[PDB]
Amino acid sequence: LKAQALAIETEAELQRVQKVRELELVYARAQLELEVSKAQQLAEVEVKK
Amino acid sequence: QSEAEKARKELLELEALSMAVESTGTAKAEAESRAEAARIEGEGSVLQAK
């Protein structure tokens, strides 16, 4: 019985952990894109000046 | 005293069986009640986890 209950709560935990880490990965990818955009534009105006 | 001991041997034989019954009953009851309560709690905890 302990095995059955641990199986249910493990599946229920792992689905939440999967969805949270997936959306966090999407948001971190977008932040990386904005980060390198700002870095290269400020580097470009520094180089040009 | 020899004949009294010959009968007392048979009384001591019967008291052995009485003591065996009186001990195994208490052991079996106190074990099976806690086993049943543990079964109830386990079957509950499966549904609670669901």
Curated annotation (Swiss-Prot), chain A:
What the entry says about domains is: MVP 3 mediates interaction with PTEN.
Hey, what tissues is this thing expressed in? Present in most normal tissues. Higher expression observed in epithelial cells with secretory and excretory functions, as well as in cells chronically exposed to xenobiotics, such as bronchial cells and cells lining the intestine. Overexpressed in many multidrug-resistant cancer cells.
Q: Where is the signal peptide?
A: none
Natural source organism: Homo sapiens
Q: How does it assemble?
A: The vault ribonucleoprotein particle is a huge (400 A x 670 A) cage structure of 12.9 MDa. It consists of a dimer of half-vaults, with each half-vault comprising 39 identical major vault protein (MVP) chains, PARP4 and one or more vault RNAs (vRNAs). Interacts with TEP1. Interacts with PTEN and activated MAPK1. The phosphorylated protein interacts with the SH2 domains of PTPN11 and SRC. Interacts with APEX1. May interact with ZNF540.
Q: What triggers expression?
A: Up-regulated by IFNG/IFN-gamma.
Q: Where in the cell is it found?
A: Cytoplasm; Nucleus, Nuclear pore complex; Cytoplasm, Perinuclear region
Write down what this protein is called: Major vault protein
Q: What does this protein do?
A: Required for normal vault structure. Vaults are multi-subunit structures that may act as scaffolds for proteins involved in signal transduction. Vaults may also play a role in nucleo-cytoplasmic transport. Down-regulates IFNG-mediated STAT1 signaling and subsequent activation of JAK. Down-regulates SRC activity and signaling through MAP kinases.
Spell out the coiled coil positions from the record: none
Q: How is it modified after translation?
A: Phosphorylated on Tyr residues after EGF stimulation. Dephosphorylated by PTPN11.
